[PDB]
Amino acid sequence: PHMAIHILTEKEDHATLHISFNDLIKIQLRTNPSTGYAWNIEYPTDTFSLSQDTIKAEPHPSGMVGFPSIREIQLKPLKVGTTTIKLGYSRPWEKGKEPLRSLTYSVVIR
Ligand SMILES: [Cl-]
């Protein structure tokens, strides 16, 4: 046993992550707020607490400001068990339609 922070990105789509009860999951995704797109996260509310949610300019601003930005969400397990996290990249004015891109992660909290 020990605390670990597990970093998930776009590249880990469909991965299954095994974590301990005192771990953190840190999802780090690029985004371009000036296009109106944003990531939306869904998970069971009785399963994780949001320990931090952040949008920030890249630490090496080579290109234009805010392009891209980094969206980071850090989740802490509330309960042990198995759960799924879904992300969608879309504009706000969507009538529940399909997002431009989707990500899915499976999490086993042991
Ligand atoms: Cl975002």
Curated annotation (Swiss-Prot):
Residue pairs linked by disulfide bridges in the UniProt entry: none
Motif mapping: BC loop: 32-37
Renumbered ranges of motif DE loop: 58-68
Motif stretch (FG loop): 92-101
GO cellular component entries: lysosome; phagocytic vesicle
Domains: entry comment: The BC, DE and FG loops form a tripartite wedge that blocks the substrate-binding site of target cysteine proteases. The BC loop interacts with the catalytically active cysteine and histidine residues of the protease catalytic center.
Subunit-structure text: Monomer. May form homodimer. Interacts with cysteine protease CP2. Interacts with cysteine protease CP5.
This protein's name: Amoebiasin-2
Species this protein is from: Entamoeba histolytica (strain ATCC 30459 / HM-1:IMSS / ABRM)
